[PDB]
Design a protein around this ligand. Sequence first.
Ligand SMILES: Nc1ncnc2c1nc(Br)n2[C@@H]1O[C@H](COP(=O)(O)O)[C@@H](O)[C@H]1O
Ligand SMILES: Nc1ncnc2c1nc(Br)n2[C@@H]1O[C@H](COP(=O)(O)O)[C@@H](O)[C@H]1O
Ligand SMILES: OC[C@H]1O[C@H](O)[C@H](O)[C@@H](O)[C@@H]1O
Length: 453
Amino acid sequence: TNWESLYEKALDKVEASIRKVRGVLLAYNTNIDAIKYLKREDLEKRIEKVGKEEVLRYSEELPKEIETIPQLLGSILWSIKRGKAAELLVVSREVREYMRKWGWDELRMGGQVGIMANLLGGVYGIPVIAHVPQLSELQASLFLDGPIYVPTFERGELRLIHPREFRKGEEDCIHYIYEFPRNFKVLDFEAPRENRFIGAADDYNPILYVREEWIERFEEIAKRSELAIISGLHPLTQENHGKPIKLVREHLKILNDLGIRAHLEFAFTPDEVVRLEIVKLLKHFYSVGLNEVELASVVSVMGEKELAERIISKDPADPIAVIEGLLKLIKETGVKRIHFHTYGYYLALTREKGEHVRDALLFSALAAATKAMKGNIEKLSDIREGLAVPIGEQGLEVEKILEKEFSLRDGIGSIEDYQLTFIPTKVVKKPKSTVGIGDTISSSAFVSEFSLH
Ligand SMILES: Nc1ncnc2c1nc(Br)n2[C@@H]1O[C@H](COP(=O)(O)O)[C@@H](O)[C@H]1O
Ligand SMILES: Nc1ncnc2c1nc(Br)n2[C@@H]1O[C@H](COP(=O)(O)O)[C@@H](O)[C@H]1O
Ligand SMILES: OC[C@H]1O[C@H](O)[C@H](O)[C@@H](O)[C@@H]1O
């Protein structure tokens, strides 16, 4: 397969079409990300001062919400050991204070809503209508210029205004991002993949706080959009899910009634009652996006523990096991589209036939490579710089497996009445950071694919 030629042609095709989109609704979680680039000596001294044995215990136990500093350091170590992204609520004032003093190297726009708003609106030029729980001064300052809007109502009429006008009195919602590189060393551990641990320390996003005007006037807001991306459900628990999930179903009903194509961005959802609820919610979505650990966790709660294990047991996620999981998911939910992304390759399983599915995946992989290389995408010209990143060797090896097991040509084949679409990713050898690449991938492919028709 001439993947370099396909990548170049996909970039030009999507650039010609991407601005066609009338508008994209983004809800619900926006926050500020405070990013720390972990260093071995600093982490080792913090672990020693806190109690190494206790930290290690927490690095081998299932992460739960963080109440003590050993739990925090052990959850970071949990993520390093496995090269996996954990995200836990920091519910203790003492630990929030510890993290605040530990500090951050930079501040970035955070949350699925905010990251996709800055990309789709600030970079691609598509109008976005964004739900921001708390639009503090700092929160507002992290939005790019461009057609990014938050809804307001004046005498009953909808007015879209730019978010860099902050709302006086609303609070900063801080999430701490602890980034570590591939092969990061601490004690006798070494990270098998670049990744991060996220300590979520705000009081609005964990409960899926929704602003009153979105509760009252959702339909009027949603009419300004052609597509919707829904996120933020991952922190909910069996104890607090009732009110948020009830609202989300009401909004999804309106999106369905208006014919607005909706995409659910999955994040790892530890609470199994909420995780299964989200799987049931997918019966009202057109598209869903997820990675290898999320797919496994979903297949696991659908009664396929052995298959879930097969999905996460190999470093390049076992492509056959992944596809078996995607088939089970699309059959149970009836979604029209699943976009799977992992280290080395993406897969899509879709009702839609044709090359536009692959065009969108390749475009999104160019966006991912640029984001990995630069840390943040600032302008459309950045995406073309992703063409120089070489195609990873893992992706090419996975393609060989898929061509023996399926009838595939240039990444396209059939399973039952679905199209299977594969691409190998362009892998940056030393990325700056990883937070936000998933959002960049899922939003870029979902929106660009729609724009190609
Ligand atoms: N954020 C996260 N990412 C991946 N797996 C997670 C996770 N949080 C939890 Br809880 N897990 C769970 O951790 C298990 C994997 O643990 P090990 O990697 O120690 O085997 C998975 O079965 C998954 O359900
Ligand atoms: N160095 C790198 N170059 C290119 N893509 C990368 C990358 N590091 C990462 Br992480 N990515 C991509 O970013 C994706 C992030 O997905 P999650 O956040 O859902 O795990 C990965 O699946 C991988 O494809
Ligand atoms: O995609 C990255 C985002 O994931 C989650 O929403 C986190 O809570 C947030 O802090 C981060 O910016």
